[PDB]
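Retro notes, item 3 of 5
We never archived the inputs for the zinc ion complex last cycle. Fixing that now. Sequence and ligand:
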Amino acid sequence: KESYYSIGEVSKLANVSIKALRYYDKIDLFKPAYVDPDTSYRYYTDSQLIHLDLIKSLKYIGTPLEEMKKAQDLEMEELFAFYTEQERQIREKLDFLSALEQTISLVKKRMKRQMEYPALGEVFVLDEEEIRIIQTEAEGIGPENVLNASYSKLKKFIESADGFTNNSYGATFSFQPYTSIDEMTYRHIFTPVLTNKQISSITPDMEITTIPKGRYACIAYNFSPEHYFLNLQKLIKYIADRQLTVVSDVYQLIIPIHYSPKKQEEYRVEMKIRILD
Amino acid sequence: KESYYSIGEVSKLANVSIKALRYYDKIDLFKPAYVDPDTSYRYYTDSQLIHLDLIKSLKYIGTPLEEMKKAQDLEMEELFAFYTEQERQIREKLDFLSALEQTISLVKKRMKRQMEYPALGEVFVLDEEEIRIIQTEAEGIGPENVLNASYSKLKKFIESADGFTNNSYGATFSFQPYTSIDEMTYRHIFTPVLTNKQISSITPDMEITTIPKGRYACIAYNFSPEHYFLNLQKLIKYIADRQLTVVSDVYQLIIPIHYSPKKQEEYRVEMKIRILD
DNA sequence: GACCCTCCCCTTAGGGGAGGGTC
DNA sequence: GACCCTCCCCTTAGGGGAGGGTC
Ligand SMILES: [Zn+2]
Ligand SMILES: [Zn+2]
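Structure as it came back at the time:
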């Protein structure tokens, strides 16, 4: 009143940094009532401090400074609408985070899964829960043929749904009394899904199915060109000796263990086939 | 396999921009297996594409690239923990937005309130709902004395609670048969609160109370040095003529109408006193 | 003729000083 | 001796070209 505030005074009163005030000046969002033409000092009236309310509040909810310059130009009925938009945007983030929170949980459940596995290289018969997936025909693809680029299209879709990208790669093949690896070929290659949201227009060459819930003869181990086939043989023998009946393809899942370009790569292999009790 | 991918190929396969790939190279987060020493072209193996899974997923949840370089160096048990932290951080934002969504709603209710007021300059008797507030003693402060800087401390606290800053300024004074404005002085000055969260250590000079729910003789109008007092007189006369009994101080609320430094300032004044039916 | 490469400029909202006057 | 001012540099994660070789 009938006197001015120095930038530092305003800074203490409005709890805004002096740097912020200068910036808001330059950007023409909030300029001092008067600026001493000689010393360049900035002077503010007590009556204009009220404009920092709109700025401080809009800044709190994260609106762009360039956006604020528009807000302090609209009427109440328009500001009312402005806030209605913010609520629409908040609900949006709430849905996003709520879903993201769910996905992280699932990713953790499955992560803990392979961390607390009975024993490696040994065949176990456990009761598996369903695992939703997206697969495709593996036309002319086998164990010694696959490439990460083979899951390219599969990953693209998953990414547009789950947001997250798959970390594990899947394949399936007919249960046969194999003799050598060059004797086997993948039927489908797949990648697990984590979201329940409808993926963008999906192409007809992609199939959304699942790995049935049920009893499975499983075996897990760390990948090794040699152990890959020897372990399958081990699985096969287990079914043969117990005279078990297979009621599904052999499912294969390969998960990387570290993602560190410094240490030598190593993958976890998981094979399991569903049986009739 | 036994050949390389050009940056553009990797870009199409992993659905990552060529610009992003070069950047990830420079930043040493994801570098090409081989770079032609003459043409400087970047070449990627199909086996390293798997490192883009961790990057793409971590990028999705917004982790800093410098942070990813650490993530791809930890073990599964550690990555598991990493995600547990993300869930803690997500819950945090969920609480924040959920609360923010609530505050915007209240701000809108009250905003609509003064937009759909019966008539200006006229006294009305309506049933008001409670309005929580934070007030302080207005030692030596009156209508022709107040300054926005007088609410400085009050605003500081509100800001640390509601996050939002108050847009309306309040005051209260004893109901008397006033003759002139220099005859009146404010008892307390206050600012409304919007959050239900415990504000930081509050000083004992701040009082958290409310404007009681009840029947009030109200009057609203656009501020004018002259109309301010004439309208109070109008309120006073209304109580006197109906022989109404006042059971509260006169409450005053001043809200700005536009926050636009281009147009002439204008405020909305709201005065009301509680009566015994 | 597409592909790829290396600069170089630009973007949010100021925080950190440095060098140097001003209340 | 506090206060304030004007540069100037720095920060995230790349997107946009420009000028010019390369598959
Ligand atoms: Zn098929
Ligand atoms: Zn008191």
